[PDB]
Amino acid sequence: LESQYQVGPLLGSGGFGSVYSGIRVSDNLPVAIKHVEKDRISDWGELPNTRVPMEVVLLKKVSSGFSGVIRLLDWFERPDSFVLILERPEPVQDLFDFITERGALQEELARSFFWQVLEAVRHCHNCGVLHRDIKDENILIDLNRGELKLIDFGSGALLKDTVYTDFDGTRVYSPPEWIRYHRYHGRSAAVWSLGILLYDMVCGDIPFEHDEEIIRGQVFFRQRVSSECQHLIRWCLALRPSDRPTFEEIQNHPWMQDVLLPQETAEIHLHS
Numbered sequence: 554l555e556s557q558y559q560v561g562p563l564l565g566s567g568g569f570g571s572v573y574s575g576i577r578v579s580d581n582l583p584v585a586i587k588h589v590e591k592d593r594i595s596d597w598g599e600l601p602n603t604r605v606p607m608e609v610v611l612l613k614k615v616s617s618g619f620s621g622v623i624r625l626l627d628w629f630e631r632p633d634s635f636v637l638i639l640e641r642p643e644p645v646q647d648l649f650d651f652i653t654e655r656g657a658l659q660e661e662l663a664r665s666f667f668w669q670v671l672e673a674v675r676h677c678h679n680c681g682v683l684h685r686d687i688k689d690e691n692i693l694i695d696l697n698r699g700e701l702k703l704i705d706f707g708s709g710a711l712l713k714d715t716v717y718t719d720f721d722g723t724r725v726y727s728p729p730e731w732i733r734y735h736r737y738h739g740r741s742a743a744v745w746s747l748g749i750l751l752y753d754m755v756c757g758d759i760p761f762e763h764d765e766e767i768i769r770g771q772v773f774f775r776q777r778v779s780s781e782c783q784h785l786i787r788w789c790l791a792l793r794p795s796d797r798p799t800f801e802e803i804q805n806h807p808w809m810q811d812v813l814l815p816q817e818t819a820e821i822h823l824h825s
């Protein structure tokens with residue numbers, strides 16, 4: 554409803570729709586207002602009571618309590634579109650633009666960011682939600698608190714233990730078993746994409762541009778990267794899904810030890 558919110562600038566637009574900066578007028582809470590056209594939504598969930606975008610289903614499942622997931626505050630239906638009201642940190646920067654600006658990240662900052670992503674994805678998985686499009690574009694930095702927040706569930710699914718045969722996320726982040734066989738399981742495809750994400754943070758760019766590089770799965774480092782970080786990246790990018798580490802094995806890996814707290818991260822690395 555437009556009496557409830559005051560619309561500000563367009564923050565961005567893409568396959569997720571159009572996202573505007575906004576202010577809830579009853580208390581001047583900062584929000585992000587996202588518009589998605591009905592005809593451009595492919596997978597529809599439905600809530601326990603009416604037919605909705607799958608994205609709202611998944612967001613409600615993960616929006617209870619605190620976490621590093623942008624939380625859904627409200628939504629509205631319009632004749633041709635859905636409108637989502639999402640929280641907005643201030644100041645905030647997409648991790649993609651952040652990497653564009655700074656290049657390859659110091660391993661200390663990548664570790665903290667990567668740790669927070671793992672914690673956020675784990676939370677999603679405990680709520681029964683598979684994101685399916687983990688990448689730097691879908692991660693926001695709360696610059697003051699040094700906290701990362703996951704966004705854009707419009708390609709996700711309910712988590713399940715059987716095989717997925719559909720995928721509509723980012724291809725250069727998708728695993729080799731999707732490219733060759735159009736089949737994957739939720740968590741090991743998620744680990745693969747986290748492998749891509751970690752590489753992207755410590756090298757400033759994704760390791761694979763084409764299907765054959767994905768399928769060959771050979772990782773070449775164009776920046777200096779510690780042997781432990783290299784070993785973790787290659788473990789997540791194991792060609793056989795069952796050779797990939799569990800979430801727990803990632804967080805017990807030697808490269809993941811002694812993480813900074815998020816406010817520490819901001820004070821040291823984000824000028825807080």
Ligand SMILES: N#Cc1ccnc2[nH]c(-c3ccc(N4CCNCC4)cc3)cc12
Nearest residue numbers: 564565572585623639640641642647704
């Ligand atoms: N604040 C906030 C917020 C809350 C929920 N979803 C978002 N997407 C975005 C967002 C999405 C995309 C972009 N960009 C702008 C830079 N080019 C890539 C697309 C910038 C911001 C922000 C938010």
